[PDB]
Amino acid sequence: SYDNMLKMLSDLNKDLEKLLEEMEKISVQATWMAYDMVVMRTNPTLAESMRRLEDAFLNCKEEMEKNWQELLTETK
Amino acid sequence: SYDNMLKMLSDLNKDLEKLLEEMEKISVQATWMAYDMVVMRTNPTLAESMRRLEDAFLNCKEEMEKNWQELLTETK
């Protein structure tokens, strides 16, 4: 059984890890999208590009919150 | 204009922050859902609950990747 538990744990760890790594990628990329925009200020449409990016961030945050509520329902 | 740039930057920072904080919450909660399950081993249906949770993790990861492609499209 010890090997069976080790296999189950391995699979849960792999799947949690894939989720965490996905979120890590989003985090780093979103941070550089923001910081790059504020440093590339010569952009002529700075106002609109900042608005588009920040509303995209809010949209993604809200979708992720709905994904998370879905997970909570699937696992309750 | 300096004050206006400060205001735009403030709003982008707020929205990026809300995204990052959402992902932080998911990260911490998903980690404790996994670790609590592996320590509450007396659970009679451990196999099924581990399967449900790991598949929920994979589903959430895949949804987040689709959300992220949506953001990349909105901001291209």
Author numbering:
A (entry chain B), B (entry chain A): 10 to 85
Sentences from the paper on this structure:
The synaptonemal complex (SC)2 is a unique biological structure, formed through the supramolecular assembly of largely α-helical coiled-coil protein components, that binds together homologous chromosome pairs during the first meiotic division (1–3). In mammals, the SC is formed of at least eight protein components: SYCP1–3, SYCE1–3, TEX12, and SIX6OS1. SYCE3 is a small protein of 88 amino acids that is essential for SC assembly, meiotic division, and fertility. Thus, the role of SYCE3 as a synapsis initiation factor may be achieved by mediating SC central element interactions.
The crystal structure of mouse SYCE3 has been reported, revealing a compact four-helical bundle formed of two helix-loop-helix chains interacting in an anti-parallel configuration. The resultant structure is more complete and covers amino acids 10–85, which includes the additional loops and short N-terminal extensions. The SAXS scattering curve was poorly fitted by the crystal structure, with a χ2 value of 22.2. We reasoned that this may be due to the 9-amino acid N termini that are present at either end of the molecule but are absent from the crystal structure owing to lack of electron density. We modeled N termini onto the structure using MODELLER, with them adopting largely flexible conformations. This full-length model fitted closely to experimental SAXS data with a χ2 value of 1.46, indicating that scattering data are well-explained by the crystal structure with additional unstructured N termini. Thus, we conclude that solution-state SYCE3 adopts the compact dimeric fold observed in its crystal structure. We identified Tyr-11, Trp-41, and Trp-44 as surface aromatic residues that exhibit high crystallographic B-factors, indicating that their side chains are flexible and do not contribute to the dimer fold. The Tyr-11/Leu-15 and Trp-41/Tyr-44 interfaces from both chains are located on the same side of the SYCE3 dimer, indicating the presence of a single self-assembly surface.
